[PDB]
Amino acid sequence: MDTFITRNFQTTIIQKAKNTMAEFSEDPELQPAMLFNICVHLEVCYVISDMNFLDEEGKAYTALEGQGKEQNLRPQYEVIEGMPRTIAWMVQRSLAQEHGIETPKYLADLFDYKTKRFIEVGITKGLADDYFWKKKEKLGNSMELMIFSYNQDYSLSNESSLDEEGKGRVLSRLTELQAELSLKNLWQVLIGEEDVEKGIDFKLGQTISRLRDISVPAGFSNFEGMRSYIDNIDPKG
């Protein structure tokens, strides 16, 4: 369950995924599938972001091994997913408002300074174009959203922003991760949809239960009997 994600993903990435799920108000234990999806989404977002960097003349260049922190001070792609809802909304509205761009009605996943556009990075399994057009249905071109898939298919938007090196890096990493999970036989653990309807958890401990038991009117032993009497007795007459 969590062992594969802990061994493969970093501590910060999994912590961000857990915080996002907690903000989304879903139990972390009974649905590992959402946890894995969030982890892989934010991880591939980081992989994409760690490719391009900004110069002083407004061009997007590439870094490699053997570079200091003075040359690596500001990024190219600003990653929004994994941040809290309030922080993410603040970042998106700030970029849109100071770049003279109307803010979309849905939270984005990345922002690019070279084209100054918001991107909704997604990963699917089926037809890439089908998911691409399904995402295109809502707003059309408010975000140059990008669609990836595990079968090495992808529906890149018109605003081309990634070259061959980074795309191949991401695809090879995805293939390696899929192979590593498949040899461990985790695919059936995640594909199978197990969503029972969940409510609000409020359980009474021992002390409060004992207080409630001794708090019933005279003539009842415990609170269960009193509650049953309240529900199932006609007090008429």
């Binding site: 009474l204 409060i208 207080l211 309240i230």
Partner: protein, 60 residues
């Protein structure tokens, strides 16, 4: 109340206050009232509404 008084009858008004209102009302009765009122609510909400009269029934 004036309009609905039966014809040929009489109507009385009692200006009343209840003595020892707070010293006689019992939190166990309030526990019963909350259990009757939240009859068709989920279990967790019923427990939540039962907590307060219980804490008042053991107050110090």
């Amino acid at each position: 109340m004036l309009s609905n008084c039966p014809p040929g009858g009489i109507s009385m008004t009692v200006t009343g206050d209840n003595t020892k209102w707070n010293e006689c009302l019992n939190p166990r009765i309030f526990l019963a009232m909350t259990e009757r009122i939240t009859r068709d609510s989920p279990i967790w909400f019923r427990d939540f509404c039962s907590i307060a009269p219980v804490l008042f029934s053991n107050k110090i």
